[PDB]
Each structure stands twice: as C-alpha cells, then as structure tokens.
Amino acid sequence: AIRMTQSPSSLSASPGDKVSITCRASQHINDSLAWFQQRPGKAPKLLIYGASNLHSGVPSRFSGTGSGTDFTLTITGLQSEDFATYFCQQCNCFPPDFGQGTRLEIKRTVAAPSVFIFPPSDEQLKSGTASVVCLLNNFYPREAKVQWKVDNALQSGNSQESVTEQDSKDSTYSLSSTLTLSKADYEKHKVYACEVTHQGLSSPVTKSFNRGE
C-alpha cells in the first residue's frame, strides 16, 4: 500500500487564525488525494478532491494545494465549526488508505485543574472490589499527569483514565482516573494518594485519604 502521513498529529488555534495541515504520500499520486472533515461524533464530509478543487457547497476559506508527494489543506478564516479532525485520502492506487488524521483544538489560556480524591463506597466493598477515583476538573491543555501512591508506593497498571471532550464554553478538559483493587489488596494499606502534575501548577498537587476515616 501507499502510506499517507499527516502533520501535525494535533493542533491548537483560535477563531480567526489561518492554519495549515500537511499530508505527505510515500510515492507520487498525481493530485489523487482528498481532504475530509469529521467533527466529533458525526460522519466525515468531503472538503477537497484532486488535491486542489473545492467541493460544491463547502466554504472558500478551505483551500487545497500540493502534488507529487506533498499536499496542504489550509483554512484562513477559522470559525467554530472548523474545530474538528481532518483526514487525507489517496485515491490513485487500489487500497485508498486514509491518513491517521489531525485534530484541531481551540487554543486557550492555561488553567490549573481542581483536584479531588474519592474513596471507595462501603457498598462496593461488600462485593469485594474497591475503586478510588481522582478527578481533575477544568484544566487546559490536556497534557496532565496523575499518579497513585499507596502507602508511599507508586502504582502502575491498576488505573484507567478517561478525559472529556473540550467543553463548549470554557474550552477546558476534565479527567477521571480510576484505581481498582481487590478488597483484599485495599485492606493491606492505609494512605491512598493521588498526585497531579500540570503546567498550570507550580508544584504537583497531592490529595489523599486514610482508609477507614
């Protein structure tokens, strides 16, 4: 197959800025490339075909250039509907492979997360499992670090993360980290701590509790 590599993987901007995304093919494809826009949850939509021709009905702020191996989609008048994910597709050879996509995110002033820790309910420990939850509230950007310490020991492999989408008004993110242990393992230790490192934070913030209190 032909490998299409888009650049960058992610990108941050504000309404009004002009942005450009690159797609490089492994070999020459003679303009046989298309640009698609996919907003979160909805279905993809054609922007440009033949690497430079604007599809009917899509606004003229979008523009396609390039050929041979290098192509560029550029938006000039960024609006709120443009904040989506963009894909390139080669359409010359048999497997018309897509690019891995580039996500376009709203640029925002840095904001520190509000950190909270949640011990497992007594109703959950009846079933023999304990889940402790760490919440990071309304921070920007997403790059954040959560680490669990159980009696001062760094935990790995027993926690899963899940982060929201960029919120409609503040353009902020929220993260949830869940540490899941057996009731047997939860019994063995006392102090449960969640330690969060974020660029909006001068120093890492540690929230903790003692089991039983």
């Binding site: 050879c93 048999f94 039983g212």
Partner: protein, 355 residues
C-alpha cells in the same frame, strides 16, 4: 439531494456473520459510482472496507479480504456488507459511502474523455473485457484506439446517462495476447475530434505468461482513468460485538470526605460500573442540576463491560442545604437507579476491615 442510511444490528454476538445494508435515496445504484464501506474503530480513525462497481466487480482491503463480501440489490436500490467471523476488534462505527468520479468544475464543452475497463484491466486469456469510453453530452462518435500496432474502432451508439455525460462500449469477447497494451478513447462532436484520453493498459494473463508493457505499488493496475472520490457519507451505524449479555449497572457514590481541608468549592460524583449495552443516561436531580456536571466516556475493560463516572461541583457550604441525587437509567435493561450521594458521618468511629 442524495442520502445513504445504514441499517444493521446495534449489538451483535462475537464470532457471527455481521450484515449491514445501505439504503440509497435520491440516486440509482446502477450508475457509474463505486459504493463503498468504511470503518472507524472507537477513537482510531478511518479504515476503508471495500467497494462495489456498477459491473458487479468488488474490491476489498487485503486486511479483511478473507472475511468481507459486498453485494448490490438494484431492485430496492440497496447494497450490503457481510463480514464473517468477527473479533471484538471489529466493533466500530460503519459508514457506507458513494465514491464518484468528481471532475474539476472547469468546463470547455469539449473536455477530455475517459476510458475504463470492465471487469478489469488484467483479463485471463480467452475471457472477455469491455472498454467504456465516457465524455460530455451530445457525443456523435466514440473511437477506441490501441497504441502499439495502431488500430482503432468507431462506434456511433452513444447513450445519455446524465444531462452532462455520454458513454459508449467496446467489447472484446475472447481476448488474446495481441490484445494487450495501451488503450485510449477519443470522441467526435461539434464537427471536430476531441483530445485523446489518458492511456489505460490492459494486461492478458496466461498459463505461465503475462503480456504487459514494462505507477502504482505491487500490482493493482488502475481500471479507469477517472479517480473516484467519496462525495457522500452516511451518518454511520455503530455496531458493538462482545461476548457478553445485557446487564444493569452497579451505582456507587463518590462522597467528598466530609471534612477534607476543603476550600471554596467541592466535588462529588456517581460511579456507574459494569454495564454491558453501551448507552446510559446520567442526569442529576432529574434535570434541576445543570451547570458544572461532567460525565466521562465509558471505558471498555477486559470484563467486556463498560464503566464511567459522572461528577458535579458544588458550593462547599451545600452539605445540608441540598441533597444530591444522581439519576442513572440504562434503557437497554431499563434499569432506572437513582442514588443520593452524601458524606460519611464521623460519629460512627473507625471502620475496620479484615478477611
């Protein structure tokens, strides 16, 4: 104008034949398009499944060619995808698409024609191949030309397929070795000949011989000089495959450690855990609580079940002022559980756990 809707199972069991159909509205499937299927795993991007051509030729991504089959039913204007023996990794949102030979909205009224082959451009010796020359409307003559040992053939049978296209067909019934080589179309209209089309090579395959001149990677010659772009996507249908069964969620409170050196604001949530069918609605106080809620995406654990959390942030003085109830309903089992989250009392002493 054109609309494609996908229908299929919402939930399907592992190891079974997945079947989806696409209903086309506002266009006929027996036209010069390629009806395709494209797949998107949860948060992983686009993967192209395959396509079907007007001639009935299908093409599958060699990743799944073992398991995929695409077919068309012209009577009801639908086309279907069948993928066999599914892994859990086949869980995804599936899109049907219409790939069309879009052309630059340039118009010379004398644009360059295109040439295509049906069923394809590699034909076994003795089998048939058909060239389809296409150009603008009103074409009076179509000629198919062969480059080396130059011979040509005229045809004046030409059909309108739209108010802007016309096409003509040349059929070779039993291809031999001397039919292999380069082919192109040229049309006569408005008292003069047009530009020649680009070349399309037809290869003939024999017992141990391949008659080909000596473009794309390993093989897979193009079969038309027109590039087909997908200009119409359906909204997609999400299909989930899992070795599991419909199950109601367990709901647990996430209480803010009543006195926790808490400052101005407080947080508290509900943890919905181990529910199979994907959609669950979480509203707090049945709607009266709107600003400040954040409910997170589900996570697929190796349990085959999902779990998420929903959280609200509140004034830190709202301990006794308001009692918070989270309202989680799981329609696929119609399990409507509502649990009030409040902090644990420090009267009862020290909770001890062992064994």
């Amino acid at each position: 104008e054109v609309q494609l809707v996908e229908t299929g199972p919402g939930l399907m069991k592992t190891s079974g034949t997945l079947s989806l159909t696409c209903a086309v509205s506002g266009d006929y499937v027996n036209t010069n398009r390629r009806w395709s299927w494209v797949r998107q795993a949860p948060g992983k991007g686009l993967e192209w499944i395959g396509e079907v051509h007007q001639s009935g030729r299908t093409n599958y991504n060699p990743s799944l060619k073992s398991r995929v089959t695409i077919s068309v039913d012209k009577s009801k204007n639908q086309f279907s995808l069948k993928v066999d023996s599914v892994t859990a990794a086949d869980t995804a949102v599936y899109y049907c698409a219409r790939a069309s030979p879009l052309k630059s909205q340039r118009d010379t009224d004398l644009p360059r024609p295109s040439i295509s082959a049906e069923p394809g451009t590699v034909i076994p010796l003795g089998s048939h191949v058909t060239f389809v020359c296409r150009g603008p409307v009103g074409v009076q003559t179509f000629r198919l030309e062969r480059e080396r040992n130059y011979l040509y053939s005229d045809t004046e049978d030409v059909s309108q397929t739209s108010p802007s296209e016309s096409e003509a067909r040349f059929r070779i019934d039993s291809v031999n070795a001397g039919n292999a080589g380069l082919f192109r179309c040229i049309y006569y209209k408005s008292r003069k000949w047009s530009e020649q089309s680009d070349y399309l090579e037809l290869v003939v395959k024999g017992e141990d011989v391949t008659w080909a001149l000596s473009a794309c990677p390993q093989g897979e010659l193009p079969i038309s000089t027109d590039i087909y772009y997908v200009d119409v996507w359906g909204n997609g249908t999400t299909v989930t495959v899992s070795s599991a069964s419909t199950k109601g969620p367990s709901v647990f409170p996430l209480a803010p450690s009543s006195k926790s050196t808490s400052g101005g604001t407080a947080a508290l949530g509900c943890l919905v855990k181990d529910y199979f069918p994907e959609p669950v609605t979480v509203s707090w106080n049945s709607g009266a609580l709107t600003s400040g809620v954040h409910t997170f995406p589900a996570v697929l654990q190796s349990s085959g079940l999902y779990s998420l959390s929903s959280v609200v942030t509140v004034p830190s003085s709202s301990l006794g002022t308001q009692t918070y109830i989270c309202n989680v309903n799981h329609k696929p089992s119609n399990t409507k559980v509502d649990k009030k989250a409040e902090p644990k009392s420090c009267d009862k002493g020290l909770e001890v756990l062992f064994q």
